[PDB]
């Protein structure tokens, strides 16, 4: 299933069109909702007073057939940026007429056309309309990849085409697009409807388009070349931009004339059909695309049932840390030692007791004899450990029922094993709380994980720039929400330049002073023209020697769902011009009770310090 | 009969060709009269030929005495020829070569080729026997509003759009269009006689006249010219027509010499009869079809 | 379909248990989450350190099986209002406790007993930790109809049972749940489980209980009567009980010892299966139960095809404006006059054409001849409009693209008909349309409607003031929601006394002065004790002589849901004795722009002017 | 309230340029052999406390002209103050009318119209929308004082009054607001970042068939500077009659004239300017049967949102 639709100028009957558009296999069908040609006076005598009806009755069709099956079109000569008053007065007049009846029809959604550089007084009276109601219908503005006037024939001998290259030139129509969606301020129901040409542009100007609300692509007829048998095809750089529209899962729609429909449409379902099939991961992270969540807070809060269950689901992350334990005992008892040395194994943050099963599967791999302590704070989470305990694994494992900067261990530990880590590693405490549990480490024991560190990565995305905002809450500041980060399965972006390291951490920790604070300063050059919307967040482990985890995507663990990327957002879009550095600052956070992070932008220009003394989010310690 | 006529034009015998659309209500469809007593029109009942086409004019035209050519909603560009009697308008040929509403029709000189203008921004020239387009041009950069023909250069026509271009074609050259920053075009017309000047229309009302080697200017509309025919005396008047429903006739200085304000919508067409030289008749969406006695 | 859960104590095994219940009909069951006789110890040595686990697994079920199947309960000892200090601190933090556990299970609801007059400790440990994350679960208080100490048998002969009547004291349950929500601030997870017994109180007993969240009701076996047959049955008084409770949607709960369940429950599908099924307006209703809605307004807003097509769904509306038409045209009209006397009609707010066709068929029902207008602002409409006075109506219908109020009329009217009614009659502003109206009229010309008056009735619903007050939203007056009427299908809620007139208008308006503001002061008997949440709205109208429309319920037109009552809220909840009469002031108030309404309490307790002068609410011109 | 009609009347400028505009109207409309026959029909239109109608007398007095007036007000508490002047001082020769201009039935046409119904930015007092109300009952070649105004802008820069347009924010209202909205100041701690230029204009009286005060204009302000635009300043011209005018531009500043203080359009964001770069500003003047608004966006160097969509955060009440 592809969702497509037909665009049409030209609808003698109604019903009669729909009928052979649904019979072609198309889901809807874009049409004018009054004549293309008919203009409308509404200021002189005597056209003025022209006899009604001035469009075809809502009566046609059926209340549902309007709401889900038309996409209203604006009429060709509406040109609220016309330079004659009287064009522009009457366009003003026509378009609000135009959309007041989209509106009272129930149109899904109503195309709007960008095909100059000016569309001030259209996003104007566009943004009037969106404030005039509480209406959830969506307005789709038809822009090209390719400007017409870059597009026509060089034949006109006293007028030639520009033959140098000018790469901000090339990328012209999406200043358009950007313009009318900041004249706007961003509106959830203005989106893109793609217009793709049979020449595609350079690789940057289809790039711009990433992380923008792309919400159809209109392939005309005409980019549709023959194979052999007679069936419609395309190049393979349109199937390439094609496979890449389609991980967006945009509405496809057809326009032009047929040079039989259901051909073009079938095409589009066997490149759906033809492409690579949805892996572990994809599968998991189905749903949750772009879906802002608050990160977990483990520590502050008591984990429910079915978010230890969710961990449980990842068969990587255990079977990495397995292979950590089994490697560390091997390398800490040897051979001759086998059946007389006892490690005492200490599991800090238990929960269920997925890294205990982990720990006894590694002995008995590595041959050795192992003392375990299970330690868990959640109260909840030990009546699980302490079931298990009883039922299965006995006086092997001692369960403790406490806080690991609390407790008051009967012996030291050979190896203490923790998963404590969040997206940004550090972020859900895992520093603060090792630091407390490392002097009942024996002086030559081990830490799994050793090592971690986060990395940042400066990103595009209008889409969830947009998201963000959405999260104003009342009883709060206003601007709350763009000084927080939320755990995200980033889909509709642009990352701007590759991720660089940002924070560290070494488990146990030997040093005199021992300070979790840091200060980052982190230069990203940007090869592109772009927005800057956020920065996302990632991390690598190691938890013993070669084992590591990894959500860095060039470095990521195969089939590891347990952590998305997290998101740190920014209160104002940052423009970010090709050659430019963005440079961002990190700052981690303390006092004794709670642990935060600062950031802010210093080139190509200022933003404001976000998060000042963590104001908008905290992590409990 | 459709309320908005769209085209009104006399051939040398002197019977009315009219074509029509409905801009509104529920079937938004289209038809072609023939009038051999031009005062009946627009009465179906006292009319010579008619037919109902599938979808709207947007324009058409007199290929010879017999044919018809047609610029449609559709995207196509269709011929129709009348019968031996003269009493039916049968489709020769319907080619849907335009991906957009064809918006103007236009015989070349030899009365075998036409060129026709759309909202896909293309003009394509024709070869009307075969029933094929010869060549396509994607010159302007938004909709053509006009093409008009040159009456003896069968190689040459002007085209006009909305990307402010008004193009002189010489189909012989490589690279065939020359441009000719005011306000859009929006008609034009050769000069009947002096084969390298031309009028054109703008969407701000003003008529101006253009010698094609090498100008003269009048603001004649308080809207956007729609039309500009000449007349066929000795020394011609030209007919100009618009969207402030009025009708103006000015004489080779742009000077006013007639108006008639009788429609009471836009007027969509003007065409000068061949029997009597002073009467000129127009048409508009008001569904009148106007006879003026032009001084 | 009747949704029941089976209450226990006593759970030996939990799957042998489920499907135990599960087999016998049950939907849920209800059930301890630690045993009940496991009494727990968190201050004191040595029995604070006693070896766990504490409870069991939460493994032993599937995620979905503890979130669906699943209602816990608070262990019966928990006692946080005890006199004993260490008895209060243990059962606080037990309470604690066995809620968290609830929580981490993902319980869909838990029950807490209200079994004695003071749970304001209980309340404070419950509200605690509804300030404790972010959460949707439920809290059903267990509260009896009938206090046990009420329900004992009179058997201590030195302490015998209260003999005599005690109005207040037979209803000291309700005020037990009235406290109890009132300390814990209307929170929407608290609702009310009504435990049934074997003797119902009296009427005014069950009564309080209207306009009470009760979401379960828990039948014990032994209310339950054996019929010859053998099969279980209920008395007439508690069928009659039960099928208010189907009314409201509660879930059942069967609770005792069996005295073969399934057997229970199928009495009870009977008694569902066996009762009056749902009319016209009941089965158009269903699904709007209480759901709160801003009244329209097509004056001031251009109402959508959709709106227009749910008005046209009403049979009885426009059969009883034919009939009023009808009348009018053989009274003004003799049989003599017939074919020669041409009515002027003018619908007035024409829609899409409902009352043109009404007006059609009165005329050709009534055989006299009538010359029409259907006036219309709406140009959305006037599309509908004019493409049928094209293809149906012809000349006989003339349409006019105009406010009322500006329209220059050709001629004058003998008949003016009109549907410019709310659901508090003049609220879409029907006075003020008509009076701009009035001057085409003909000096013995008629208005339809004629008259109309609306009707106001004080109102108890803890559900509706709750969801008046979920209504808050940013960037206004934090209390603007309860200043503002809402259109509502009330259904849990009580009816405090008989509505009562409040606002009458009269057109054509004959009076050298016509001003549309009123003042109205009602007085309203309460034979109850009871809270007064806001005023239920309702009207009437005459359309002409004796046909009429109407929306009061002991009057309301059979069939005819196109409108539905409108409530008035207060900021304030206002308590009630049983014989205190409560007295309202409204206002009608307006400008040259605006309309608006202003109300408040002055008797028993006065209350703010809500709306001072249209803050939070007006009816735009 | 009184005391801002006593602190109108503490300008001698405005009154004495309102004297001569009609001084010099009444002797172009008069010639000096009808000068005892013919009385001119003088309307003050939103006369307040009467000092017009005192220039218009010291005016007919100065021309040795005869006049009979009209003074129009809406509030009936300066009504009170024109019946008592009136009673005390006028006569007969003014007759008070408390009404407002757009309903006044007139018992005759008027030969001059003389009013005082101008904001800071010209037309955001409603001058407008008034003065076509009152316009039928001026005669067919009367004259208006004023006939004419138009108001200009000016970028600027000043982080001081951004910061105070921040403060602004207030509880249950949109949370910004404030940037959305114009502010009357004396504009001290600012740069001006180009010269001012015309934005809208109106004539009185409004010869033309359809009648729209709707508005939509587009500036082009060189920079040659680098700076941050925080808002534009606005100002406004008006002539009164011929060479008589009154001028708040800083340029052309009427001296001594205290009754206006610049205007401020403020943007929600600091905008960026290079020197060389060209800041493009868009102004809009909108309404409604009920309500009078402006919307404002930068376009370059970088655009801006649309500010006061819909008239969400001000409007004008008509
Ligand atoms: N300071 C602490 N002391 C003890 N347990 C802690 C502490 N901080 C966090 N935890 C627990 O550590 C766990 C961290 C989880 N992200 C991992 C759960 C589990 N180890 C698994 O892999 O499924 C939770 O069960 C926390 O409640
Ligand atoms: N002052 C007005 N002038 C003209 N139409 C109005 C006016 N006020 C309201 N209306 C229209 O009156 C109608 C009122 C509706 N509630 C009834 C619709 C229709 N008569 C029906 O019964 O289906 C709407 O179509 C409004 O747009
Ligand atoms: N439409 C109106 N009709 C009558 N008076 C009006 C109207 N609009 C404004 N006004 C009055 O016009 C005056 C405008 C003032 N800014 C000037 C006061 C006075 N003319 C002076 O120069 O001291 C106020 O007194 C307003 O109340
Ligand atoms: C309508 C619908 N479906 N079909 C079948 C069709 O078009 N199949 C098709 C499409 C594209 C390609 C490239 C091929 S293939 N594998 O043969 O190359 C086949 C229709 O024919 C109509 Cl008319
Ligand atoms: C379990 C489930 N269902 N049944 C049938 C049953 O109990 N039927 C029933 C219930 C109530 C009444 C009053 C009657 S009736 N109409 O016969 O009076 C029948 C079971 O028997 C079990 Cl065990
Ligand atoms: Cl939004
Ligand atoms: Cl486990
Ligand atoms: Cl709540
Ligand atoms: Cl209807
Ligand atoms: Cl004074």
């Given at each position: 299933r592809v969702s497509s639709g037909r665009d049409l100028n030209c609808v003698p009957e109604i019903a009669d069109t729909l009928g052979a558009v649904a019979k072609q296999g198309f889901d809807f069908l874009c049409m004018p909702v009054f004549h293309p040609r008919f203009k409308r006076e509404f200021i002189q005598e005597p056209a003025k007073n022209?006899?009604?009806?001035?469009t075809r009755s809502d009566l046609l069709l059926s209340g549902r057939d309007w709401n889900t099956l038309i996409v209203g079109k604006l009429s060709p000569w509406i040109r609220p940026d016309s330079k004659v008053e009287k064009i522009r007065r009457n366009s003003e007049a026509a378009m609000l007429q135009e959309l007041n009846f989209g509106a009272y029809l129930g149109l899904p959604a109503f195309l709007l056309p960008l095909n100059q550089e000016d569309n001030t007084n259209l996003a104007r009276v566009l943004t009037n309309h969106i404030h005039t109601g509480h209406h959830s219908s969506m307005f789709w503005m038809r822009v090209p990849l390719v400007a017409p006037e870059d597009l026509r024939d060089d034949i006109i001998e006293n007028a030639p085409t520009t033959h140098t290259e000018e790469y901000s030139g090339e990328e012209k129509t999406w200043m358009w697009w950007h313009n009318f969606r900041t004249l706007c301020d961003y509106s959830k129901r203005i989106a893109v409807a793609l217009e793709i040409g049979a020449d595609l542009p350079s690789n940057h100007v289809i790039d711009?388009?990433?992380?923008?609300?792309?919400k159809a692509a209109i392939l005309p007829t005409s980019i549709f070349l023959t194979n052999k048998k007679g069936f419609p095809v395309l190049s393979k750089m349109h199937q390439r931009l094609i496979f890449r529209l389609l991980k967006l899962e945009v509405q496809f729609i057809i326009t032009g004339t047929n040079h039989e429909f259901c051909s073009y449409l079938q095409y589009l379902e066997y490149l759906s059909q033809n492409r690579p099939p949805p892996n572990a991961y994809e599968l998991f992270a189905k749903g949750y695309e772009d879906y802002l969540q608050s990160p977990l807070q483990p520590l502050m809060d008591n984990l429910e049932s079915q978010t230890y269950e969710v961990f449980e689901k990842d068969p990587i992350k255990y079977s990495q840390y397995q292979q950590a334990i089994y490697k560390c005992l091997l390398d800490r008892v040897p051979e001759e030692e086998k059946d007389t040395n006892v490690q005492v194994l200490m599991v800090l943050g238990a929960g269920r007791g997925p890294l205990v099963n982990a720990s006894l599967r590694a002995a008995k791999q590595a041959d050795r004899r192992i003392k375990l302590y299970a330690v868990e704070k959640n109260p909840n989470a030990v009546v699980t450990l302490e079931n298990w305990q009883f039922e299965?694994?006995?006086?092997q494992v001692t369960v403790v029922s406490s806080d690991m900067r609390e407790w008051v261990a009967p012996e030291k530990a050979d190896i203490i094993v923790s998963e404590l880590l969040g997206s940004f590693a550090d972020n859900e405490l895992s520093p603060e709380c090792l630091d407390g549990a490392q002097h009942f480490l024996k002086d030559d024991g081990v830490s799994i994980p050793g090592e971690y560190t986060s990395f940042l990565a400066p990103i595009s995305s209008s889409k969830l720039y947009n998201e963000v905002r959405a999260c104003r809450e009342k009883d709060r500041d206003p601007e709350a929400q763009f000084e927080m980060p939320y755990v995200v399965r980033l889909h509709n972006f642009h990352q701007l330049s590759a991720p660089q390291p940002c924070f560290t951490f070494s488990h146990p920790n030997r040093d005199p002073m021992i300070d979790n604070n840091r200060y980052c300063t982190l230069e990203f050059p940007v090869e592109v023209n772009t927005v800057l919307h956020g920065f996302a967040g990632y991390f690598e482990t190691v938890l013993y020697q070669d084992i590591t985890l990894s959500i860095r995507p060039e470095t990521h663990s195969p089939g590891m769902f347990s952590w998305f990327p997290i998101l740190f957002p920014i209160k104002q879009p940052i423009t970010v011009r090709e050659g430019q550095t963005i440079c961002v600052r990190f700052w981690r956070c303390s006092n004794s009770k709670k642990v935060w992070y600062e950031w802010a932008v210093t080139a190509p220009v200022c933003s404001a310090i976000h998060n000042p003394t963590g104001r908008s989010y905290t992590i409990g310690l | 009969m459709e309320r908005q006529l769209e085209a009104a034009r006399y051939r040398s015998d002197g019977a009315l060709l009219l074509g029509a659309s409905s801009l509104s209500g529920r079937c938004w469809a289209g038809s072609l009269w023939l009038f051999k007593?031009?005062?009946?029109?627009?009465?179906e009942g006292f009319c010579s030929a008619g037919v109902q086409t599938e979808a709207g004019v947007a324009d058409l035209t007199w290929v010879g005495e017999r044919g018809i050519l047609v610029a449609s909603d559709s995207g196509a560009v269709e011929l129709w020829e009348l019968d031996e009697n003269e009493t039916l308008i049968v489709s020769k040929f319907c080619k849907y070569?335009?991906?957009?509403?064809?918006?103007t029709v236009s015989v070349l000189s030899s009365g075998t080729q036409a060129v026709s203008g759309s909202k896909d921004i293309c003009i394509k020239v024709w070869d009307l026997a075969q029933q094929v387009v010869l060549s396509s041009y994607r010159a302007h950069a938004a909709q053509v509003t006009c093409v008009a023909a040159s009456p003896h250069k069968d190689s040459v026509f002007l085209s006009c759009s909305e990307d402010n271009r008004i193009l002189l074609w010489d189909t012989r050259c490589p690279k065939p269009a020359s441009q000719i920053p005011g306000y859009l075009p929006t008609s034009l017309a050769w000069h009947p006689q002096q084969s390298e000047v031309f009028v054109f229309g703008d969407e701000n009302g003003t008529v101006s006249l253009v010698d094609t080697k090498s100008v003269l200017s009048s603001a004649?509309?308080?809207?956007?010219?729609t039309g500009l025919v000449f007349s066929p005396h000795s020394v011609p008047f030209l007919a100009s027509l618009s969207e402030d429903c009025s009708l103006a006739v000015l004489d080779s200085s742009l000077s006013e010499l007639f108006r008639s304000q009788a429609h009471r919508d836009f007027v969509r067409d003007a065409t000068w009869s061949p029997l009597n030289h002073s009467l000129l008749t127009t048409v508009g969406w008001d569904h009148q079809v106007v006879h003026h006695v032009v001084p």
């Open positions: 022209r006899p009604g009806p001035q711009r388009w990433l992380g923008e609300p792309i299965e694994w006995g006086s | 007593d031009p005062c009946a029109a627009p009465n070569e335009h991906d957009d509403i064809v918006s004649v509309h308080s809207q956007c010219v």
